[PDB]
Amino acid sequence: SVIALGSQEGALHQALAGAIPVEFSSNTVKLTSGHLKCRVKMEKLQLKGT
Amino acid sequence: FNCLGMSNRDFLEGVSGATWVDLVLEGDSCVTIMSKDKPTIDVKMMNMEAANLAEVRSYCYLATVSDLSTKAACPTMGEAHNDKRADPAFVCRQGVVDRGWGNGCGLFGKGSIDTCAKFACSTKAIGRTILKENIKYEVAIFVHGPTTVESHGNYSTQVGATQAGRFSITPAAPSYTLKLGEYGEVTVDCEPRSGIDTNAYYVMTVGTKTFLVHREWFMDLNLPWSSAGSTVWRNRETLMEFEEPHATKQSVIALGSQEGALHQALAGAIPVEFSSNTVKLTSGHLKCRVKMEKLQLKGTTYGVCSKAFKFLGTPADTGHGTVVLELQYTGTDGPCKVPISSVASLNDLTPVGRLVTVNPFVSVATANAKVLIELEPPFGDSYIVVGRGEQQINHHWHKS
Amino acid sequence: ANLAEVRSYCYLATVSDLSTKAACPTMGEAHNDKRADPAFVCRQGVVDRGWGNGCGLFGKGSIDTCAKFACSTKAIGRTILKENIKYEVAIFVHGPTTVE
Amino acid sequence: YYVMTVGTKTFLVHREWFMDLNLPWSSAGSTVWRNRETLMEFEEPHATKQ
């Protein structure tokens, strides 16, 4: 008897929360996962109607 | 229906001067019983069936997480009531969203939100119970009368030879007296009682692979469920919805179905074959009392076989401390007793190997008949021997 | 605005075809022809037997059966190299405005 | 005990010492398994020649 082992998606699902969810199209991964360190230089930012 | 060749075999000698024996039978097991001056027999439980189960719970793995709803409420306007809250048509849950002018509302701050998603079931990991009157047992009894490698396993031949039988036991009538022709009869009084494993375990059904799980592991699990109705409760497993959205759309992602949750707890619960309405217990046992003062020998008034006897091949190890082998009788004479014993050293006077196939004998008068024999030889080296003097043959053996 | 796969775990089907290369006691091991190509997955074992089932002597006989293997639902996974990554930053100025 | 044959000098060895030894092997076929004894290959080379 070569019983096909029952496929229990629980094994996967169970470890859901651990890994963060992300929208993915065939070739793309929109990072939300991701961050960006910036330096907002603005000595050129100026008031108006003063 | 007989013991030879099975790995779950147990040999028994009831008691001293006992015409009966108390025994225990289970699923795929067999038992060979010996008794002074009486045929050897094999009691064996064939099948365990309910000829009436009932469902108890039903956990689901699911689909329908398609329809959506988002009843919006502006800040200070109170809570939000979604019409999809009148019928279990959907599952609703409230939340709040930071908003104001930016998105159509007059003031700035937290606004109510009560969305809803739909719920129906797909694959129901159904489960049921096993009440300790529909339980019937099927016990098969064999008689170690004349046989051959061939006929030994043929139920037909054996029944025909009145050296076998298959009857059933029920709580209604827990006993039976199986008649075996001139061999008299054997009367078992099996007592349907069993634990065996107590009904305490639930009947887990998953797609195709049925299993036997612990009441609690089952009952106390986390998954949607429904007793005997189309109504489902705790469907909260329609989770991972609260992206903590906007009044426009609250993503209602269908929770990934991971059969691992189930599978992972495989080994724990014992597996069992289950047909729509039946559960063959292997889980189950049966305490019997094989009364057999009515079991009797046959062909005891015949003379000893006196003609050459040839082996038909190296005896084989049953894996039980006994060996099997098949003889051939050059003899032309009819039904005579087969002179076979186990001797510690050539030409010893007293035997040492007890025969399982007690009081063996050539069934027919048709020369060159075959005879099957199972015997337990002593440990270490020994000799199997058939016939005596210069007719006698022999074959050595060494048990460990 | 270029990923690449790395592994692929499966949940499966094809467990349909069977095989059972039998070997009598003392006749050694059993070699199933379905062992030449990954067409099937084979595994050996031993069975108590003898006259009862066609064999000459009594005892443990070799056994090497095989089942087939192909995949159904591949729980695929890939990598994310740290030049195709572009960011979109939006800057606002708190100049005159209305709720609108 | 097994029947050990080596070139010319035949011997009688213990089932296990024999069966449970480390060397390539083949039952009754031209097919060989555990040929891993084709060892000492991994000079941990270059794509050109290992």
Q: What angle do CA A6, A11, A12 make, to 5 degrees?
A: 120
Q: How far apart are CA C91 and CA B75, in angstroms?
A: 28
Q: Which residue shows structure tokens 């001139």?
A: B182
How many of the other CB atoms lie within 10 Å of CB of B356? Answer: 23
Q: Which residue shows structure tokens 């963060």?
A: A20
User: DSSP letters of B6-59?
Assistant: -SSEEEEE-STT-S--EEEEETT-EEEEEETTEEEEEEEEEEEEE---EEEEEE
Residue D19 belongs to what H/E stretch? Answer: helix D15-19
Chain breaks in chain A (C to N over 2.5 A) after: 32
Are B277 and B23 in contact, with CB atoms under 8 Å apart? Answer: no
Residues facing residue B304 across a β-bridge: B337
Q: How far apart are CA B82 and CA B93, in angstroms?
A: 9
Question: Which of the 8 DSSP states describes residue B361?
Answer: B
**Strands A28-29 and A24-25: what pairing?**
antiparallel
Largest CA distance in chain C: 102
Q: How many angstroms separate the CA of residue B249 from the nearest CA in chain C?
A: 22
Q: How far, CA to CA in Å, does C61 sit from each of B27, B193, C82, D14, D19? A: 24, 38, 58, 19, 16
Residues facing residue C67 across a β-bridge: C41
| Strand residues in B149-305 grouped as ranges (E) | 164-169, 176-179, 185-188, 201-206, 209-214, 270-271, 274-275, 278-279, 285-291
| Strand residues in chain C grouped as ranges (E) | 4-11, 20-22, 40-49, 59-68, 73-79
The torsion angle over the Cα atoms of residues C37, C41, C45 and C48, rounded to 10 degrees, is -90
| Identity of the amino acid at B291 | K
Q: List phi, psi (to 5°) of B325.
A: -170, 160
In chain B, the residue whose alpha carbon lies closest to the alpha carbon of C57 is B316
Count, residues in chain C: 100
Residue A12 with chain B: CB contacts under 8 Å: 256, 258-260
Nearest CA to B232 among B64, B399, B34? Answer: B64
User: DSSP letters of B92-105?
Assistant: EEEEEEEESGGGT-
Q: List phi, psi (to 5°) of A13.
A: -35, -55
Residues facing residue B374 across a β-bridge: B324
Q: How far apart are CA B99 and CA B350, in angstroms?
A: 104
Give the side-chain half-sphere CA count within 13 A for B124: 17
**Strands B274-275 and B278-279: what pairing?**
antiparallel
Chains that touch C (3 or more CB pairs under 8 A): A, B, D
Q: How far apart are CA C18 and CA C34, in angstroms?
A: 10
Note the Cα B212 to chain centre separation in Å: 11
Q: Which residue shows structure tokens 């729509």?
A: B276
How many of the other CB atoms lie within 10 Å of CB of B209? Answer: 20
Q: Give the full edge-to-edge strand order of the sheet including B38-50.
A: B9-13, B30-35, B38-50, B135-143, B164-169
- Cβ density class C76-97: b for 16+ within 10 Å, e for less: eeeeeeeeeeeeeeeeeeeeee
Q: Which long-range contacts (CB under 8 A, 24 or more apart) does D31-37 make?
A: D31/C31, D31/C35, D31/C36
Q: Are 3 or more Cβ–Cβ pairs between A and D shorter than 8 Å? A: no
Q: List phi, psi (to 5°) of B89.
A: -50, -35
Nearest CA to B330 among B384, B373, B366, B374? Answer: B366
Q: How far apart are CA A23 and CA A8, in angstroms?
A: 24
Binding-face residues of D in 11-50 toward C, CB within 8 A:
27-29, 31
Residue D31 with chain C: CB contacts under 8 Å: 31, 35-36
How many of the other CB atoms lie within 10 Å of CB of B208? Answer: 9
Are B281 and B192 in contact, with CB atoms under 8 Å apart? Answer: no
Q: How far apart are CA C35 and CA C64, in angstroms?
A: 9
Helices assigned H by DSSP within chain B: 155-160, 215-219, 260-263
What six digits make up the tokens of D8?
């010319």
Residue C36 with chain D: CB contacts under 8 Å: 31
In chain A, the residue whose alpha carbon lies closest to the alpha carbon of B258 is A9
Residues facing residue B206 across a β-bridge: B209
The torsion angle over the Cα atoms of residues B227, B229, B233 and B238, rounded to 10 degrees, is 110
Residues with Cβ within 8 Å of B35's Cβ and at least 6 positions away in sequence, in order, are B13, B14, B18, B19, B21, B292, B295
What six digits make up the tokens of B394?
């022999």
Question: Which of the 8 DSSP states describes residue B260?
Answer: H
What six digits make up the tokens of D11?
């011997």
| Identity of the amino acid at B182 | E
Q: Which residue shows structure tokens 């809250």?
A: B85
- In chain B the first and final C-alpha atoms are separated, in Å, by 29
Q: How far apart are CA B263 and CA B269, in angstroms?
A: 10
| Identity of the amino acid at D34 | R
How many of the other CB atoms lie within 10 Å of CB of B263? Answer: 21
In chain D, the residue whose alpha carbon lies closest to the alpha carbon of C62 is D27
Nearest CA to B341 among B329, B359, B365? Answer: B359
